[PDB]
């Protein structure tokens, strides 16, 4: 199972790790992708996860969008985890850089409650432009299922742990 995580709460764990490497090692039931509404996995966590699947994640995602249309900001869909996990839960956090409502971050994290255990990044962090300290706070106050957070950046990981209330 998951190893080397620091326990933050009864159900939230955190590790300084590359979520792609973490997923390839653990092969969790669910890996969360930091998706956009179009499932266009160009960069950040999404680009990295998609590149690890040899673009199979993007091919599957394009078929999903062709059939269903875009997701909502704050919404999600379950697709294959390919070589990374049994499933990938594509979750759309608000992208502050595109002027999206930060209040939708709680709705985005609520998607995690449909899965007993997940490997995930901090939603809306990184290239999505939100404050990762705020994202972790919303995560701990919203997710009730077991969430293993992978934080790529060591300096950000240290700041998140050291400032965690």
Ligand X SMILES: CNCc1cnn(-c2ccccc2)c1
Span from 14-22, 54-62, 106-114, 128-136 in contact with ligand X (CB under 6 A): 14-22
Helices (H) and strands (E) in the chain, counts: 6, 7
Q: Which of 96, 87, 125 is nearest to 109 (CA)?
A: 125
Q: Which is nearer to ligand X, 71 or 120 (CB)?
A: 120
d(CA 163, CA 156): 10
Q: Which two tokens stand for residue 112?
A: 């995690």
For position 44 contacting ligand X by CB under 6 A, the verdict is yes
| Helices 19-26 and 44-52: angle between axes, nearest 10 degrees | 40
For position 48 contacting ligand X by CB under 6 A, the verdict is yes
SS3 assignment, position 1: coil
Span from 15-23, 25-33, 53-61, 71-79 in contact with ligand X (CB under 6 A): 15-23
Smallest gap from Cβ 153 to ligand X, in A, equals 8
Contact 142, 11 (CB under 8 A): no
Q: Which is nearer to ligand X, 68 or 84 (CB)?
A: 84
For position 147 contacting ligand X by CB under 6 A, the verdict is no
Smallest gap from Cβ 151 to ligand X, in A, equals 8
Contact with ligand X (CB under 6 A) among 20, 31, 123, 160 = 20
Contact with ligand X (CB under 6 A) among 5, 8, 15, 18 = 18
Q: Output the CA–CA distances (angstroms, integers) from residue 112 to 105, 153, 158, in the order listed.
A: 12, 22, 24
For position 62 contacting ligand X by CB under 6 A, the verdict is no
For position 93 contacting ligand X by CB under 6 A, the verdict is no
Contact 20, 48 (CB under 8 A): yes
Q: Which is nearer to ligand X, 97 or 103 (CB)?
A: 97
Q: How many CB atoms lie within 10 A of CB 113?
A: 13
Interface residues with ligand X (CB under 6 A)? 18-21, 44-45, 48, 121, 126, 152
């Amino acid at each position: 199972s998951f190893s080397g995580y620091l326990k933050l709460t009864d159900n939230v764990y955190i590790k300084n790790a590359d979520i792609v490497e973490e997923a390839k090692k653990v092969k969790p039931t669910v890996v969360v992708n930091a998706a956009n509404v179009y499932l266009k996995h160009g960069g950040g966590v999404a680009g990295a996860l998609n590149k690890a699947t040899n673009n199979a994640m993007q091919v599957e995602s394009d078929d999903y969008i062709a059939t269903n249309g875009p997701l909502k900001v704050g919404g999600s869909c379950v697709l294959s985890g390919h070589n990374l996990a049994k499933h990938c839960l594509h979750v759309v956090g608000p992208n502050v850089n595109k002027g999206e409502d930060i209040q939708l971050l709680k709705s985005a994290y609520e998607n995690f409650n449909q899965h007993e255990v997940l490997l995930a990044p901090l939603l809306s962090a990184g290239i999505f432009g939100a404050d990762p300290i705020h994202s972790l706070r919303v995560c701990v106050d919203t997710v009730r299922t077991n969430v293993y957070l992978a934080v790529f950046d060591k300096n950000l990981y240290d700041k998140l742990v050291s400032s965690f209330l």
